[PDB]
């Protein structure tokens, strides 16, 4: 309201002033109305925002008046106007008028520049109100901040030094006023005053902007920053020190700052313990961080001096860590690969942090959050995160991270080490990664959902990077490192089995370049037996049988190729052992034994004395299961154990040539028929007999003379007699008829 009443008066005064400015000889009337308007700025009852708004409205009107005067002098004159404006009854209007005329004179009159500018600045020292004098100095700055006695002078009044003096003197007076803002009004409105000061900070910094359009580095050193640093350190306030130092740093050139870095750090040392030194120091270090991230042992000088500063303080641990993070950001960005500097960060911060850390738990602490960001900084800044692993104690300090966060940080790092299709892990890098793994695995629904499928695939790939025999030794040490219990190796070791499958071949690709390669295979197969025996500790799991079964078949094939077949047979016998302990679910044994059949159906390196023996074992255990359908299915497959089938019959012992043991095949098929008759279900018995007949067709066309057309005739007659004569019609019975018709079509 007060603001609005004043603004109404301002618009009234601006209206008659502009009508007066229109009329020549009403200029004095326009100035009298302008003084009446500026009297509104003499109030101290406006809120900070309201006083700002009143100042801006009066300022724009003053700009209209000031342009009118700055045009009148360039076209005719107005005599003694500098004197005439000192006639005004109201002092704030009077001083605003002297500034307006001063700047008009500066435009018209080049010769009086030093004396008139010096006069206007000195007499503006009369303002006894901080806010009104500051706003007055903006009117001055808008009027004459651009006209200062400067390098624009070519020999008459003024030089760049005079402008430097003018602005430094303006700084000192504004700074005295700025502190005095702290002390005007009542003491309990301190936060409001600091808010007002935050509002008016631009008033101080416009001078710094004006200074940055000015003299060079030696002049900066002697006659800007020097002065500025004594004032900055002795003003002893917080809002001004933080604002003014950041404004100086951005606004003045950093080439200049570089030549003055030590002057800055010696100013940082010259501050109150009771001013918010933490904010200024954090902001300076952050700025140096920017001096690092925008992609003179600065590191040593600034690093060591910063430790002296922190010792000169007593700091919150989180603040210390945030400064350490910014120190990390500086060293990382300045020295991504100067390992000695990175190590100096690693060494010269971390133990000291642990003593300074009154190490209670610190996970939710922002000091922890920062310590993560700090550790991430090597990780983010690395072209090669391997270089973090080149720091001997980078990894070892992760032990000294607090432990929940050891999981969070170690997981996140290892995952990042996995999204990048990362490089060779050398034994040294294997040891550091393994140490990280021991922290992950030790002490022991997976609420982690880590880790393994892309983890095993990556691990098996990079294992190959080191040389292959060494890979076995590394694999063996990792195998000891896998002491974590029963629910890992199931998914982790079979990929290691394949890693051995490639290494056994890598040995064979030297079979004429080595002959202990066979012995090396021997060592790997003893390793395989030891590792599988390790799994047998894990009796609690399903597929313990299946996985072992496929591994023994695979190892048997490798033993053939490595000619190291002596440990194949043992492994197959042990696979039978697996067959005995692994009976827990009836359907599961039928599928598993069928898997046993199929693996034998590729198992091709057994000497026929061993193979046929195995075939009979398989047939007996098959013939010792529960139910007649499965018994039939297994019996007809043991027909396939002797015939021109399976993959086994294209063997490294069969030389792709087939067994064709057709007499025994006939005996097996006849036994399958004997089991088939005792199905005691008309439809399924006939369907199976048709399938068996088709098996007869198979051996007839495979030229199994023991499979005779007479057997086909007797089986088709029995199918004909049952199929129509005692089958209740059914979709299965129709399918069995369709199958029998097909089988007749095949037999021609």
């Amino acid at each position: 309201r007060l603001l609005e009443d004043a603004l109404i008066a301002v618009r009234q005064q601006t209206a008659m002033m502009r009508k007066f400015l229109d009329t020549p000889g009403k200029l004095m009337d326009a100035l009298k109305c302008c003084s009446t308007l500026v009297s509104e700025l003499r109030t101290s009852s406006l809120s900070p925002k309201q006083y700002y708004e009143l100042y801006m409205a009066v300022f724009d009107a003053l700009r209209y008046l000031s342009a009118h005067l700055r045009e009148n002098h360039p076209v005719n004159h107005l005599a003694d106007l500098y004197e005439l404006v000192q006639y005004a009854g109201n002092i704030i209007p009077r001083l605003y008028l002297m500034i307006t005329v001063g700047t008009a004179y500066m435009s018209i009159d080049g010769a009086p520049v030093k004396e008139l500018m010096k006069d206007m600045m000195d007499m503006s020292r009369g303002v006894q109100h901080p806010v009104r004098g500051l706003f007055l100095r903006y009117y001055l700055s808008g009027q004459a901040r651009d006209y200062l006695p400067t390098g624009d002078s070519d020999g008459p009044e003024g030089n760049l030094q005079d402008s430097i003096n003018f602005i430094l003197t303006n700084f000192v007076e504004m700074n005295k006023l700025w502190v005095r803002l702290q002390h005007q009004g009542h003491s309990r409105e301190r936060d409001l005053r600091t808010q007002e000061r935050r509002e008016l900070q631009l008033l101080v910094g416009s001078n710094i902007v004006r200074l940055s359009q000015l003299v060079d580095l030696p002049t900066y050193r002697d006659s800007i920053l020097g002065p500025l640093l004594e004032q900055i350190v002795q003003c002893r306030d917080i809002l001004a020190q933080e604002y003014l130092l950041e404004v100086i740093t951005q606004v003045f050139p950093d080439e200049y700052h570089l030549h003055t870095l030590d002057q800055f750090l010696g100013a940082v040392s010259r501050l109150n313990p009771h001013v918010n030194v933490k904010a200024i120091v954090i902001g300076m270090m952050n700025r140096l961080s920017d001096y690092a991230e925008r992609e003179v042992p600065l590191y040593d000088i600034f690093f060591d001096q910063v430790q002296h500063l922190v010792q000169a303080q007593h700091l919150p641990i989180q603040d210390t860590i945030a400064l350490c993070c910014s120190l990390a950001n500086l060293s990382l960005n300045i020295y991504p690969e100067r390992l000695d500097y990175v190590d100096g960060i690693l060494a010269y911060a971390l133990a000291k942090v642990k003593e300074h850390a009154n190490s209670a738990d610190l996970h939710s602490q922002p000091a922890q959050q920062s310590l993560l960001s700090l550790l991430q900084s090597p990780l983010r800044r690395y072209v090669s995160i391997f270089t973090a692993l080149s720091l001997p104690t980078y990894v070892s300090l992760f032990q000294a991270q607090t432990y929940p966060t050891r999981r969070a940080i170690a997981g996140e790092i290892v995952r990042t080490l996995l999204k990048n299709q990362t490089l060779i892990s050398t034994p040294a890098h294997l040891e550091n990664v393994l140490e990280i793994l021991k922290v992950l695995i030790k002490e022991g629904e997976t609420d982690e959902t880590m880790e393994e499928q892309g983890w095993l695939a990556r691990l098996v790939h990079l294992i190959h990077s080191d040389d292959n025999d060494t890979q076995f030794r590394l694999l063996q040490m990792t195998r000891k490192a896998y002491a974590e219990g029963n629910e890992r190796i199931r998914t982790t070791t079979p990929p290691l089995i394949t890693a051995g499958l490639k290494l056994a071949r890598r040995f064979k690709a030297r079979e004429h370049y080595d002959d202990n390669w066979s012995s090396q295979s021997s060592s790997l197969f003893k390793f395989l037996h030891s590792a599988i025996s390790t799994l047998y500790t894990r009796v609690n799991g399903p597929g313990v049988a299946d996985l072992c079964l496929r591994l023994f078949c695979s190892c048997g094939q490798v033993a053939d190729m490595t000619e190291f077949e002596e440990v194949a047979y043992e492994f197959f016998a042990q696979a039978f052992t697996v067959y005995e302990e692994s009976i827990s679910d009836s359907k599961a044994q039928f599928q598993a034994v069928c898997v046993i059949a199929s693996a034998l159906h590729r198992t091709r390196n057994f000497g026929r004395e061993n193979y046929d023996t195995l075939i009979t074992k398989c047939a007996q255990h098959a013939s010792k299961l529960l139910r007649k359908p499965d018994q039939c299915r297994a019996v007809y497959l043991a027909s396939h154990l002797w015939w021109a089938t399976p993959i086994a019959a294209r063997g490294e012992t069969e030389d792709t040539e087939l067994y064709r043991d057709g007499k025994r095949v006939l005996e097996c098929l006849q036994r399958a028929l004997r089991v088939a008759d005792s199905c005691m279900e008309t439809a399924t018995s006939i369907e199976l007999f048709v399938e068996i007949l088709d098996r007869y067709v198979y051996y007839f066309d495979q030229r199994n003379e023991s499979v005779t057309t007479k057997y086909l005739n007797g089986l088709i007659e029995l199918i004909h007699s049952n199929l129509a004569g005692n089958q209740q019609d059914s979709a299965s019975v129709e399918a069995s008829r369709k199958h029998f018709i097909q089988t007749l079509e095949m037999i021609q």
């Binding site: 597929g543 399976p646 399918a735």
Partner: protein
């Protein structure tokens, strides 16, 4: 038919012998492209299950020969598209690869096209006994039992006709190579 694209893939052997789709192939098989995926096993985990689920709006899977812990899935499946009936299995609930045995199984299942991925881990296909036989090779590049072309297929059914598109990462260097194959059901 087949405004509903069916991905055909095999010999994945995750983590058994090979672990992933070729990147160029995963993008050729990216979600929003495939409407149904027929996967030939060895995923083996829940993570692979949910990703494959995310690939297509209708995922149909049968039990795998090493997929022995997933007791809930069916062992075999037939699908029909227009006049064609398509059955598929890994082969472990199948008994061998003898021609008469495949024909007999196809006749019980009333199928015309059979996809399998045996130990050769080599893409091949041929027609035999008026039926269609497809081996997608190794979708992951799984090593072979033989003495390597990553491959998969995008089968296309129209009426009584089936068009097979096979995508392969062939070596000259890994290059994506596409081939078209057509199958037409006997009348």
């Amino acid at each position: 038919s087949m405004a509903f694209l069916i991905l055909v893939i095999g010999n994945l052997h995750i983590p058994d012998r090979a672990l992933d789709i070729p990147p160029k192939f995963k993008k050729l098989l990216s979600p929003g492209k495939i409407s149904q995926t027929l996967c030939l096993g060895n995923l083996t985990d829940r993570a692979t299950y949910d990703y494959l689920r995310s690939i297509s709006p209708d995922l149909k899977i049968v039990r795998g020969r090493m997929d022995v812990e997933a007791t809930s899935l069916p062992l075999m499946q037939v699908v029909t598209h227009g006049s064609l009936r398509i059955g598929f299995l890994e082969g472990f609930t199948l008994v061998s690869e003898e021609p008469d045995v495949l024909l007999a199984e196809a006749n019980k299942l009333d199928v015309d096209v059979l996809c399998w991925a045996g130990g050769s881990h080599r893409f091949e296909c041929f027609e035999y006994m008026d039926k269609f036989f497809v081996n997608p090779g190794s979708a992951t590049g799984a090593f072979t039992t033989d003495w390597v072309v990553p491959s998969f297929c995008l089968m296309d059914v129209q009426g009584i006709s089936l068009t097979l598109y096979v995508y392969q990462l062939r070596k000259d260097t890994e290059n994506v190579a596409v081939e078209k194959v057509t199958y037409t059901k006997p009348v």
